[PDB]
């Protein structure tokens, strides 16, 4: 199977160790699509913020924000698939009695709430949360209370599903834990470097490089770019 | 949307206090089928197993067996989707220098590898059955060498395109942790009154029942019956 679109992790493969976007991960990418391949970003950040990097970056698929529970369009349009309203509410209460807290980016997030807490409120936090229906966990910013089931695995479906492609023609690129709900379906993976041994075992393709710098090779490696 | 088919996991759902088959699930089944309704059974048994209770018990749709890894058709065939070549072998490998033991029923396996264990060499054997894909976890009657991804999650994903189903027209029934990966998926979902915690906070009807008896309460609560 010839690979038709590449699923990447924002936060987690395109950038530095400083978090800034690798910009040779950036041309990577335009060649890539140049070429005829369709590319899809997927953060836990808000879906202003990927939107953004899918108009300056040039990015060509659809891009999801809150790590899959939130959508822009090939159409121009706002699509989510999980409410807020729950896990907001799970906020204001743990908040009362715990470091769990808001952040910023919570005005624009539509689809799950995002948060800060201290390191020894986390069992606690993740047993209430998952009574609830809720699952907790971090990514690029912060950590996210999320949606049972709301994840990249959800997102990488309904790109398989509006492209009408066959698992095998699609490519994943992620690093770590919370990259392996889409590492598990029948698609095809690549990682870093510095990606988890879990991911690595899993994968089609480990690069040498990291950082952004794995895009590239990965890209020739399938013979993308 | 209108439930059009039942996902249902055997082990905890299907069966009574002596995990016996429940007559009573049974004679559920057949009249949701007599009125429509298409039924998938799922469990870790090997095919001729699942087999058996497709013939015997009256199943109308697909059934698999070992976790979702090999199928039994509507047309009397069976469809492997992972091999057992590497499991095998590693069973084989891990026998020589920990208790790892393969079972009887391996004899009919062939996508996955069955095992019993002494408790405290499970670590020992999960590290080094991750690091070459693989998962493992006891249900049912034994521990399980998985190929990571052989899930039932991605066996209502092959449902769900066999029968050209929107998710929101497929219902699971599931109890235990993993059972957790069909309850991800954006489907219809319910659970009998002794699920785990877990698995009740993300379904859409808790039974007031189990052993059997919540798959009619839960059928007649989705119209089925
Ligand atoms: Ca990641
Ligand atoms: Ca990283
Ligand atoms: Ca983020
Ligand atoms: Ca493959
Ligand atoms: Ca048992
Ligand atoms: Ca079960």
Redesign the pocket.
Known sequence: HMIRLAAIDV?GNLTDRDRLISTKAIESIRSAEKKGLTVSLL???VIPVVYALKIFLGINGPVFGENGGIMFDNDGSIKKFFSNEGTNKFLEEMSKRTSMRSILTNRWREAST?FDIDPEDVDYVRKEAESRGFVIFY????WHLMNRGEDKAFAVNKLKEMYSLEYDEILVIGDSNNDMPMFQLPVRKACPANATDNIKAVSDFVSDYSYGEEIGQIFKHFELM
């Open positions: 936060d953060s836990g950040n995002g990514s690029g910013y912060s």
